[PDB]
Write a protein that binds this ligand. Structure first.
Ligand SMILES: Nc1nc2c(ncn2[C@@H]2O[C@@H]3COP(=O)(O)O[C@H]4[C@@H](O)[C@H](n5cnc6c(=O)[nH]c(N)nc65)O[C@@H]4COP(=O)(O)O[C@H]3[C@H]2O)c(=O)[nH]1
Lengths: 171, 170
């Protein structure tokens, strides 16, 4: 079972650290340059994770980078954590701005697919994706750092933008 | 068992992406500003991974940051990848300079030992450490990216400085 460890490292190595200081980073960018106060993580269950968000959906267009977050991490002095802000256009009109990004471990699960000495097969990507989404939301349920600082966007394959709009419109 | 997947994550999400551009980054630092041409990966099997190499061994001293590496990954525009270069003093005398860092997954295995939903338990974090290093060693052996662009340093506790210096000498 690979997805279990990837969900935990994703929380132990990233979410536990940037979420407590995310609200302050969004606040700092709003005063200098109306993004919502939440990190939205795309987790396609197909694990079709492209590197460019605009390449996946034309409606999803990059807006600007969040103020970097630094920190000494495992012998790396001032390791920079980067978060990208995106605006979502529907029918040529922007309807929401947010800090949007994919769940990178899913990209890793998709690539681990191809290799020979990977644990899981190439036909178990989907259940691994389903196992990652369940384990992450299980962790973020009992996680004291996730004080409604992020929301999980899980879907199966289409309009990605309006799935994103559905959640931000909720806020 | 979790140590197998995080060795694959360490290789797929980091090493396979930075090792190919490692020597070009060391050469840039060297000409514009005597750093080694390999990335040194400390692998403490105790799993006691501190955030500051400073404090684990005073002789290991942080001097400068390697030139950044950026790239678009998983929807983050130009994601920053940071590497730190250290000086290692031997009896008050600098003996080597290299890009030195810990294996972050080992720090995560230690942290997960505490959490209940994590598969392994406290007693198991040591076996996972050696298991992570083994898996990473097998992956690098068949890794086209690993043109010996990095060296793994496994050590069970003491002078970390010496353990590092032994390898750099060779
Ligand atoms: N959006 C975003 N997400 C982040 C960032 N840093 C970590 N994450 C997420 O958290 C996972 C685990 O991070 P890790 O514990 O540092 O475990 C990392 C770490 O050990 C190594 N690594 C990744 N990036 C860097 C880096 O910039 N510097 C160093 N020294 N190591 C890195 O590779 C492992 C796996 O990397 P990933 O596949 O990327 O998997 C990463 C990624 O999904 C970030 O700056 N931005």
């Amino acid at each position: 079972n690979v997805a279990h460890g990837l969900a935990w490292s994703y929380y132990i190595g990233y979410l536990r650290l940037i979420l407590p200081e995310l609200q302050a980073r969004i606040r700092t960018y709003n005063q200098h340059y109306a993004v919502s106060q939440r990190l939205y993580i795309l987790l396609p269950l197909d694990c079709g994770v492209p590197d460019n968000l605009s390449m996946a959906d034309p409606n999803i267009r990059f807006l600007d980078k969040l103020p970097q977050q630094t920190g000494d991490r495992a012998g790396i002095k001032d390791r920079v954590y980067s978060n990208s802000i995106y605006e979502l256009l529907e029918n040529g009109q922007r309807a929401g701005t947010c800090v949007l990004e994919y769940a990178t471990p899913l990209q890793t699960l998709f690539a681990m697919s191809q290799y020979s000495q990977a644990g899981f097969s190439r036909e178990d990507r989907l259940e691994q994706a389903k196992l990652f989404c369940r384990t992450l939301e299980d962790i973020l349920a009992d996680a004291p750092e996730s004080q409604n600082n992020c929301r999980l966007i899980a879907y199966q394959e289409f309009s990605l933008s309006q799935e994103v709009l559905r959640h931000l419109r909720q806020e």
